[PDB]
């Protein structure tokens, strides 16, 4: 339980950091918490994945996903598509994510899910770093700017 808490906090930090570069949509902003996946949280899952997928490839997201989710059917489709897309990414980038199984999408929560999401978020962050590196202390910058 201690390890689960630590990882969840790490996840929260990474998401907060991402939000500083890419603002969170209003729906997701209210859901974001350090303990949001200690228990299964389907609602947070959908919005977090939505956010991360858009950051990664908005065009691909538009092609693969229907949004916003309006009914149970559309929700089921979102989960299935999520698994498919994640597999695709795993193969394409050789991320070696183990057991991208239906359970990640059915009861998103717990240690296994948090670890997965941490890896995924890490991946998204790495892709963004690459983009930024191509395009191109915080205290010193702040003082200099002032």
């Amino acid at each position: 339980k201690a390890e689960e808490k630590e990882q969840s906090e790490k996840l929260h930090r990474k998401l907060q950091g991402l939000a500083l570069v890419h603002p969170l949509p209003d729906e997701l902003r209210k859901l974001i918490a350090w303990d949001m996946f200690l228990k299964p949280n389907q609602v947070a899952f959908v919005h977090v994945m939505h956010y991360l997928f858009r950051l990664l490839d908005p065009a691909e997201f538009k092609r693969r996903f229907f949004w916003p989710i309006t009914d149970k059917k559309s929700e089921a489709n979102f989960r299935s598509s999520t698994v498919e897309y994640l597999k695709h990414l795993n193969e394409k980038h050789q991320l070696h994510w183990a057991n991208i199984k239906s359970y990640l999408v059915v009861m998103p929560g717990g240690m296994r899910f948090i670890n997965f999401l941490l890896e995924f978020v890490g991946f998204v962050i790495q892709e963004l770093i690459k983009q930024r590196e191509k395009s191109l202390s915080a205290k010193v910058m702040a003082r200099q700017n002032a």
């Binding site: 930090r13 990474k14 950091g17 991402l18 500083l20 570069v21 890490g122 962050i125 790495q126 963004l128 770093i129 930024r132 590196e133 395009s135 191109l136 915080a138 910058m141 200099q144 700017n145």
Partner: peptide, 15 residues
């Protein structure tokens, strides 16, 4: 942490 590095790059760009 990868996130701090990203933030650093963003900060540099904006600066």
């Amino acid at each position: 942490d990868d996130i701090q590095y990203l933030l650093h790059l963003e900060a540099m760009r904006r600066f």
